[PDB]
Design a protein around this ligand. Sequence first.
Ligand SMILES: *[C@@H](C)C1=C(C)C(=O)N[C@H]1Cc1[nH]c(/C=C2N=C(/C=C3/NC(=O)C(CC)=C3C)C(C)=C\2CCC(=O)O)c(CCC(=O)O)c1C
Ligand SMILES: *[C@@H](C)C1=C(C)C(=O)N[C@H]1Cc1[nH]c(/C=C2N=C(/C=C3/NC(=O)C(CC)=C3C)C(C)=C\2CCC(=O)O)c(CCC(=O)O)c1C
Lengths: 153, 160
Amino acid sequence: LSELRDRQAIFETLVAKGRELLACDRVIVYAFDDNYVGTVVAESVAEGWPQARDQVIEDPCFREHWVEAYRQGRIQATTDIFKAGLTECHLNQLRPLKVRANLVVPMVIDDQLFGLLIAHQCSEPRQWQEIEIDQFSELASTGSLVLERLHFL
Amino acid sequence: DHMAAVQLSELRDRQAIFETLVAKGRELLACDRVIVYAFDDNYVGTVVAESVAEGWPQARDQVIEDPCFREHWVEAYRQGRIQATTDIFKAGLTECHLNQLRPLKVRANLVVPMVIDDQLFGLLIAHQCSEPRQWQEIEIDQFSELASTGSLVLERLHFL
Ligand SMILES: *[C@@H](C)C1=C(C)C(=O)N[C@H]1Cc1[nH]c(/C=C2N=C(/C=C3/NC(=O)C(CC)=C3C)C(C)=C\2CCC(=O)O)c(CCC(=O)O)c1C
Ligand SMILES: *[C@@H](C)C1=C(C)C(=O)N[C@H]1Cc1[nH]c(/C=C2N=C(/C=C3/NC(=O)C(CC)=C3C)C(C)=C\2CCC(=O)O)c(CCC(=O)O)c1C
């Protein structure tokens, strides 16, 4: 990882390592351009589960305020999205992907947010453990160090 | 939930990087000691940080002999070598090398390089002192990932 000098290779590594790390159903990188508008840029998904790129998922074309919360280091660890008080529109974004559990960590260095590293469990609800959250978020941070290095180099 | 209050990836000071490497490494492995042996610009290495379990000797409390020049064994680590030694008294080490570790009461010895693109920042080292100990593949991978993360942050300091 530390040696990668290509954006897409980094994103695909993160996504493979993340799913391996958590043994969950899907890991995704939702990456931000300069306007903090985001797109799904990579996905690792267990066989048989829906792939993001096969769906049309609505996503408002502006930077919503949760972007700033992640930028400051918010982590979302949701055991079951149907019990978490999500908006209907948000549930509708995750429904096609058959999400139950939702773990969202920032890929951020010095308050520059490169993206979000996201895990889903689809088969059933899943309580994310502290040590999984720590390891997944260290993976995000390492990926972020190498994304940032791209600019320097 | 929230990212940790201090992150290795957010450190912007050399010595802080070494001290968090050594704290996190000893917690990861639950071993007796973790050190960083860091290289200066002339490839001279120095123990710059240590985290050690209660009751075991501290590196800085000892006089450990160490040839003033860069030895040949350094190149193997620059190139990515890892040494994982279950019991240093049964590993065919030289007497002089044994005498560097005796004062620290080392039995097991794990050595991973802190290296990016052929720049060797140091070695991250773990000791078990209480008993011999066979380092597991999972431990070696995790310890080595920590070392590489530390190396990314040392490198960044140059750029910054
Ligand atoms: C519904 C289209 C929409 C309206 C209208 C609105 O104003 N905002 C939403 C619902 C909404 N969504 C989130 C959080 C996220 N939205 C994401 C967008 C995506 N685009 C995709 O292609 C995709 C498939 C993986 C998604 C999920 C993302 C990445 C997030 C953050 C991750 C997550 O929380 O799922 C919110 C904020 C929820 C909260 O934190 O309060 C809202 C209101
Ligand atoms: C003994 C003074 C000496 C002579 C003479 C010589 O030519 N080389 C040695 C013995 C020797 N040491 C190593 C490898 C290491 N030596 C280290 C130096 C240290 N300085 C310290 O303060 C200290 C306390 C922690 C140490 C251990 C270190 C860090 C190493 C690498 C890590 C390890 O292997 O313990 C060698 C090379 C042996 C090999 O790997 O083939 C030799 C011959």
